[PDB]
Design a protein around this ligand. Structure first.
Ligand SMILES: O=C(O)CCN1C(=O)[C@@H]2Cc3c(n(Cc4ccc(F)cc4)c4ccccc34)CN2C1=O
Ligand SMILES: O=C(O)CCN1C(=O)[C@@H]2Cc3c(n(Cc4ccc(F)cc4)c4ccccc34)CN2C1=O
Ligand SMILES: *[C@@H]1O[C@H](CO)[C@@H](O[C@@H]2O[C@H](CO)[C@@H](O)[C@H](O)[C@H]2NC(C)=O)[C@H](O)[C@H]1NC(C)=O
Ligand SMILES: [Ca+2]
Ligand code: NA
Ligand code: NA
Ligand SMILES: [Zn+2]
Ligand SMILES: [Zn+2]
Length: 750
């Protein structure tokens, strides 16, 4: 029996909340623990009360002490007020009763709560509105790809991309075992979640999981109940979860009028939470995070592309369907199965095609969706509002699309003593929360993909002091060291010189129009920096040796002549040179990089047309460009070990991508090279591909397609730091936490 052991935190008859899922509860759990009687609200008559065990909650004078009161008791029978009726009072300091070592954290998570419901629900969710308004909040929070529940909830809790924590979807095929696994035990998965991190550091955690038949009102009383327990038992961190509004969203669509009740209902539970805390004097002591795993889009049966309309033998493939596609051979010894053919077959075959196929390594890097062996090589990015099935109602809403999509954005509100008061912060990525939650609990966070510091502007106190990483390889500064005859060939640095964070050998090179860091190992620049202010020739096939760099560690024009696939281009573009004299610097062999003919069309468009437009538009730009090597698609700078391809019969490694970081003043009335304030930045990581299969209008003028591809491969600065092992923005006039925020920014074009 459960006697009074009920909802306990720890062979026998079981009393914990998760027992009902494992069907291991004692026969009397439904009698003692899950009482439903009289409802979840007091009334005038209920007050002055027999502390009747039969009830769900009590309105007796006993009530307050035992810690099992109905959440609106004070409001109804001691004259006090609903917390939503009070005016925002700032909380300059945690107001906890004696013997609390720290402010409790309550994570209030909701499935499928799209960011728009905040504007178009103000009227119907007043308690949530009061959290938003009095607390700290962002316009939206960005989930991770894929925008599905389990992958997002576990990232939330761990700080890791799905590729790394391992929950890449609900069914996953492991080719090591040739078996499929259907999704819960935290422990077999990657990363350290929050409830563990806290436990290992002597901070007691409550459950982050509930048995679905336990109704929401009971879960709240349970948390308030636990909060009255004594110091040696009481947990410091708790978690509520709601399947709504995701559940109704699938059924009715995010804009269905049927959505209105479910949000009101979620708001009621958030009401009980606050009314309950308040009547335990804990409403200015606990920190609450109201947070969402992802959003919801309109998607119906009739918007469904079918693979059988593209592929000869569709019974030879296995497809995970829906708002993303994952394709895999169904049969093990099938020599008829050809990934290159499949992708070709699925590539721009209709003008209005509602998905695009990709091998995972060609997916835009911002998705971080490749480095896991249960991610099938062939992936389909599905257009928003659409589905993908194998071959030929329930639903009008779904999610799982590209996480830059708006319908997929989600919410974050931070209320409490440690959060700023009435503050609006910019949108961030949910991988950043794990680090913040550790901060609120005094924990050293486990290694994750967050960037610790980048969210210090959300917090009143408890900010941790991030430190710039150390240069690992100091630069060389060659002077004029060689003769033209030794060779057998054929202001611009506004934010600090970036710092090389791995062991290598590089020369820093200066020119009038640009500054560069040249790797004597990779035979090209690691980075090329140049400012262009707001305000040609027939030398195409000439290159000059750089006299500051030995011919051993320079590229040559023989390799590029004898490579019928590969060509070369410049990181600093000759077109932007400041004078006929200076133009010769842009043609130094130290400025060449390997570039497929197809990539040049993108790259020339960019250097010739978009940079000067960007400069006009933003009042100057600083531009840092370099190559990236990521052949193992793990999002990190490759070692020489990992390089698969080279320019014909040479040591010149071919980059898998090319980055650029484009930087200006937030105050566009000050030019780029004379800021006094915050910075503005947008970056991208363009894949380096022999063809333009990815862009459906590549046969047209670059004005009609290059800029669309670029928007698609937008990237955070931080992404490029991981992929290049550099560190940018080391010598600005801004604080290091502000700069971390700048670096986590991704410029979405929506
Ligand atoms: O070291 C190695 O490579 C193999 C060793 N090994 C393990 O001992 C655990 C066992 C286990 C794992 N998972 C997660 C998983 C999910 C989908 C899959 F297709 C494969 C695994 C589980 C989930 C439920 C119950 C047990 C497990 C992952 N493990 C290993 O890979
Ligand atoms: O109560 C219900 O309506 C259904 C029971 N249920 C769930 O379906 C989800 C599944 C899930 C939960 N968590 C923990 C969590 C909670 C809040 C966060 F901000 C982050 C993580 C997960 C972690 C990884 C993967 C799956 C999950 C919580 N759930 C339930 O109790
Ligand atoms: C995301 O975070 C994880 C954890 O910090 C990084 O993964 C670790 O990588 C190291 C070195 O490659 C391995 O030895 C560890 O086993 C990895 N840990 C886990 C839990 O997977 C990962 O590199 C980060 N990803 C990016 C793109 O920055
Ligand atoms: Ca790599
Ligand atoms: Na060539
Ligand atoms: Na094309
Ligand atoms: Zn969800
Ligand atoms: Zn869903």
């Amino acid at each position: 029996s459960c006697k009074g052991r009920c909802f306990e935190l720890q062979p026998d008859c079981r009393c914990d909340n998760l027992c009902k899922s494992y069907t291991s509860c004692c026969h009397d759990f439904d009698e003692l623990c899950l009482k439903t009687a009289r409802g979840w609200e007091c009334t005038k008559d209920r007050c002055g009360e027999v502390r009747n065990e039969e009830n769900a909650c009590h309105c007796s004078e006993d009530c307050l002490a035992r810690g099992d009161c109905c959440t609106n008791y004070q409001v109804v029978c001691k004259g006090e007020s609903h917390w939503v009726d009070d005016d925002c009072e700032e909380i300059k300091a945690a107001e906890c009763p004696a013997g609390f070592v720290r402010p409790p954290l309550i994570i209030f998570s909701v499935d499928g709560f799209r960011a728009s419901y905040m504007k178009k629900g103000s009227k119907v969710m007043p308690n949530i509105e009061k959290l938003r308004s009095c607390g700290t909040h962002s316009p939206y929070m960005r989930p991770v790809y894929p925008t599905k529940t389990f992958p997002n909830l576990y990232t939330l809790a761990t700080g890791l991309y799905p590729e790394s924590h391992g929950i890449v979807g609900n069914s996953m095929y492991d080719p090591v075992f040739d078996a499929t696994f259907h999704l819960f035990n935290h422990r077999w998965w990657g990363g350290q979640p929050l409830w563990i991190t806290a436990t290992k550091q002597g901070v007691k955690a409550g459950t982050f999981f509930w048995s679905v038949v336990i109704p929401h009102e009971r879960r709240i009383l349970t948390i308030l109940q636990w909060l009255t327990l004594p110091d040696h038992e009481r947990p410091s961190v708790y978690a509520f979860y709601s399947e709504q509004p995701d559940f109704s969203g699938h059924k009715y669509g995010p804009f269905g009028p049927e959505m209105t009740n479910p949000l009101r209902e979620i708001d009621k539970i958030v009401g009980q939470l606050m009314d309950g805390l308040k009547q335990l004097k804990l409403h200015r002591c606990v920190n609450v995070i109201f947070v969402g795993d992802h959003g919801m889009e309109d998607v119906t049966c009739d918007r469904t592309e079918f693979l059988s309309n593209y592929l000869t033998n569709v019974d030879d493939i296995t497809l995970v369907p829906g708002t993303l596609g994952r394709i895999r051979s169904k049969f093990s010894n099938n020599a008829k199965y050809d990934p290159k053919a499949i992708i070709a077959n699925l590539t721009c075959k209709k003008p209005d095609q509602h998905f695009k196929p990709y091998l995972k390594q060609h997916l835009p890097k911002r998705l971080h969706y490749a480095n896991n062996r249960r991610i099938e090589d062939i992936h389909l990015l599905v257009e928003r509002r659409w589905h993908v099935a194998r071959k030929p109602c329930f639903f009008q809403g779904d999610h799982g699309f590209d996480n830059k999509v708006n319908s997929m954005q989600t919410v974050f509100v931070g209320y409490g003593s440690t959060f700023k008061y009435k503050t609006k912060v910019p949108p961030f990525e949910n991988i950043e929360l794990y680090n913040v939650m550790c901060d609120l609990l005094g924990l050293k966070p486990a290694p994750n993909n967050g960037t610790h510091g980048s969210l210090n502007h959300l917090l009143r106190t408890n900010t941790f002091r991030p430190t710039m990483p150390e240069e690992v390889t100091r630069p060389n500064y060659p002077g004029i060291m060689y003769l033209q005859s030794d060779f057998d060939l054929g202001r611009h640095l506004l934010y600090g010189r970036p710092a090389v964070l791995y062991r290598t050998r590089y020369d820093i090179l200066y020119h009038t129009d640009f500054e560069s860091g040249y790797s004597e190992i990779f035979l090209m620049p690691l980075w090329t920096s140049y400012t262009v202010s707001k305000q040609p020739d027939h030398l195409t096939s000439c290159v000059r040796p750089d006299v500051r760099v030995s011919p051993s560690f320079s590229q040559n024009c023989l390799a590029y002549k004898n490579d019928k696939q590969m060509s070369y281009g410049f990181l600093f573009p000759p077109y932007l040179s400041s004078s006929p004299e200076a133009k010769y610097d842009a043609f130094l062999v130290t400025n060449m990089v390997p570039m497929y003919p197809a990539f040049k069309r993108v790259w020339n468009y960019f250097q010739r047309v978009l940079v000067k437009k960007y400069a006009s538009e933003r009042n100057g730009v600083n531009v840092i460009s370099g190559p990236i090597f990521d052949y193992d698609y793990d999002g990190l700078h490759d070692t020489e070990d990992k390089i698969k391809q080279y320019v014909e019969g040479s040591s010149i490694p071919v980059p898998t991508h090319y980055y650029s970081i484009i930087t200006s003043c937030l105050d566009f009335t000050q030019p780029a090279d004379k800021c006094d304030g915050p910075l503005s930045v947008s970056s991208f990581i363009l894949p380096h591909r022999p063809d333009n299969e990815e862009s459906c209008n590549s046969s047209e003028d670059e004005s009609k397609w290059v800029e669309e591809l670029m928007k698609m491969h937008t990237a955070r600065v931080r992404d490029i730091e991981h992929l290049t092992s550099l560190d940018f923005f080391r010598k600005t006039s801004r604080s290091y936490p502000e700069i971390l925020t700048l670096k986590t920014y991704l410029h979405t074009y929506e």
